[PDB]
Amino acid sequence: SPIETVPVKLKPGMDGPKVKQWPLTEEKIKALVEICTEMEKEGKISKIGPENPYNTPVFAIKKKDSTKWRKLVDFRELNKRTQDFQLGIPHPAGLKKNKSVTVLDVGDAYFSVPLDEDFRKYTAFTIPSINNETPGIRYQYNVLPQGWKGSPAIFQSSMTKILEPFRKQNPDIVIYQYMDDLYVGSDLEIGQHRTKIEELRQHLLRWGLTTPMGYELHPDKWTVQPIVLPEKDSWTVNDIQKLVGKLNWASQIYPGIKVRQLCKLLRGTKALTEVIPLTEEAELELAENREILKEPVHGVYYDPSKDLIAEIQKQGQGQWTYQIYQEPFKNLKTGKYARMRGAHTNDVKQLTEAVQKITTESIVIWGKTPKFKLPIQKETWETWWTEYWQATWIPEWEFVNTPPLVKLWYQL
Amino acid sequence: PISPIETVPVKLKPGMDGPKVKQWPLTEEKIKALVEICTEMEKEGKISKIGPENPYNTPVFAIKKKDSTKWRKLVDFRELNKRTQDFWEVQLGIPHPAGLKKNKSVTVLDVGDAYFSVPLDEDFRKYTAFTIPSINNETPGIRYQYNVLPQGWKGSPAIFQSSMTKILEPFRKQNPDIVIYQYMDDLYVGSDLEIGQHRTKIEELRQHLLRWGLTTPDKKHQKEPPFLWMGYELHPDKWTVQPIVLPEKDSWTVNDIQKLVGKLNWASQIYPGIKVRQLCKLLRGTKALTEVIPLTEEAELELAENREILKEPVHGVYYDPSKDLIAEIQKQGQGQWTYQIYQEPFKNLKTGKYARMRGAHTNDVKQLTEAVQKITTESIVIWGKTPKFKLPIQKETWETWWTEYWQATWIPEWEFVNTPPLVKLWYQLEKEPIVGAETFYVDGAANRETKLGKAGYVTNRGRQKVVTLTDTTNQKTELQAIYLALQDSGLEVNIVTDSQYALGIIQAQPDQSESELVNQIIEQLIKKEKVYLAWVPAHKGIGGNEQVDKLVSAGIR
């Protein structure tokens, strides 16, 4: 049912994406063929020729409470070459303050709006084949594609119309749209909250988009976990040394930190195991620092012109710590992630879970995804991330070698 | 023929126009050849004479192949190619034999005069203009233009490919249980039908292709197994590498060793055990290609071991989609790993080897994991699934390492296999300070200008020592200092450094390094019974570190 298409434009000089397709399992290839031959019949996508030199990677995932393969297109390159995405969506500051936030997939809506004829070329993707027997199956989009930041930007107009009645009826409810999802926050009792979401799904239903008691977030119960200073009766040189290092480091973040009194204890070439009684003076400094570490961090402020960065550390025992900043040490947010009953034997599984959780929080707090620094081997992550990935979006990532100390500093 | 297939719309790069490269004046003989060649092509619709309007031109040439007095027409499309749009990419990989499914009957059909049987977009033909010059730049030359995909044009491989895909589609739909592999101008067909029906299915295919302008060989013209395909020898039930001949030679050149390593790496696909590490070592620094390189005792042994392996012809089996894939890995030596993939115990579909990471400080556990990863990737590419692993590492060793390492790691379903040498960790750092063990506070410094440096320690038992180092770095002194403390310590030691660098290296339990020093440290760490390593920030009122920083810094700014 075409309408007047919104003319899209790449950044001046910037050219379309030409990203290689990574090998997929037969299982996923089969699933994508089935999905795509169905989207073709529905006119959402159509086959393309070799005169289309563009390519975007494609995968197959399965969301939580879902046993039906879903197509996930990695538009990260196209997204970076677009904006346009010009007329963006404003991020509400009230969302992070709501007692509860519900995430709703509204991606099925995008398939109604036709995509600008002259832009279609850039949405090209390939379904690969095993052992390269057959050349890849090539298609492009005719309708707004899921995963492209241009789709929500274009769909704003229609989304506001859809939500207008619900908005006027519940003006205290916060609605934020980010990519294929809707974030709905209220301060209501969990019962009313869920009732209001159900009502919202009906509104969406009237517009052809079946939006299925989704993941429930509680941004109120989100509290930045401190750096954590030990609490012992007797201390060794090793413990004070471990403490001095930790504080020395934290002093780079929180200015008010002092270490002169504690350091005074560490004088002479003593054995690491020697017990050392702490001077009443060091006791204060210590306690005083713990107080500082309880509170946020004076000086750090979100700068919307700069990228968000997230670092993750493997703590062991299914535990993971993470930090979000724009400039190193200037932590806008720190947190933890403990393996949920099941991943009792998988690091990659836990890391993908942790990445999705952190990304979700970023979207809620800043309306932006962070650039990840992953403590893993590229090829390993490349090989397995899709096995446990359930988000409709994909953040930017790089692979790093965790500095051993950083693990301790944030260790709990 | 010329396929009746709809053409692919082609265009030049945005801010560009067609080529306008002048014709070089050509020899009388070369001009004669072009005229006849072009007359033939013109008669077959491959090319067409053009008006004076067309302002485009691309140089034309003529060369004759030896042992024959038959001329060939060469067009230099370098310019048009720079002006032609970018296309897709024919394929992301070449089929690997090991991935070929077992089928009772297989046929190879090559598409004859491939590129020339496919039409070119009419709106683009104008840009393919070429000129046969007149004897001595007399008057206008005979001007032509292509109607089909020109040999050596940028878009030909891709356009041909697509045209074949479009052509094969209906036949694919009506015959889902037949495998067709598209490779350049070739076409391989497989079925599980008894000859009779298969030759019928082949014939039907050829008829579908011919109905579309593509000629193929008929029965008596089709190749017969063995098939010599892209370096391989294909038989209906097995495959191998094209006969490999290891040159018997006295005095080897860089070029000779290069080709040797090439053939060996190539043979590694099916011949298990091939070692190349010692030969690659000779190729370090090289500086020349004709320079002869004397073979080390180790390379001679390696080469001899390879000959033995290659003396016995080995074959690979084909893929059965119903059975699981099993990959086994073995340690061949220092950073050397081999693997084999089979479905039925010891009937290999494929072989391979692994020997990465230039000694950036590693251990056998990290290496094994890397080899598993590499194997996993290729399995997905070749078979669309991951194999079940058989590893020479204890589940206990594995869990101990993974749980405690800082990087997330994960091996798919694997099973321990008692195949020595087994993978293990050679030493382990203590989790907490050792009571009644001397504490060495180490440190190292190095002058940036002079490259001179000092390394040393001071203990809790009041000991002290400071070594002077020449042509050093800060990194090297920090590692030298730790090495010193390990030398003068004995069985149990607590070591406190200010170097995150050294702490990082040692913590990863390395057993191999490119650094002679790190090897000293490893060798020393293995001898110990207990070792605890701690870190402190430098330049602080921290007893111990504050002091070693004095003697090590004195005389070295």
Ligand SMILES: CCc1nn(CCO)c(CC)c1Oc1cc(C#N)cc(C#N)c1
């Ligand atoms: C379906 C194609 C095919 N399957 N098999 C397994 C038989 O059980 C073989 C071995 C003979 C094939 O032949 C090729 C011949 C040539 C040639 N020339 C190339 C390839 C490829 N790829 C394949």
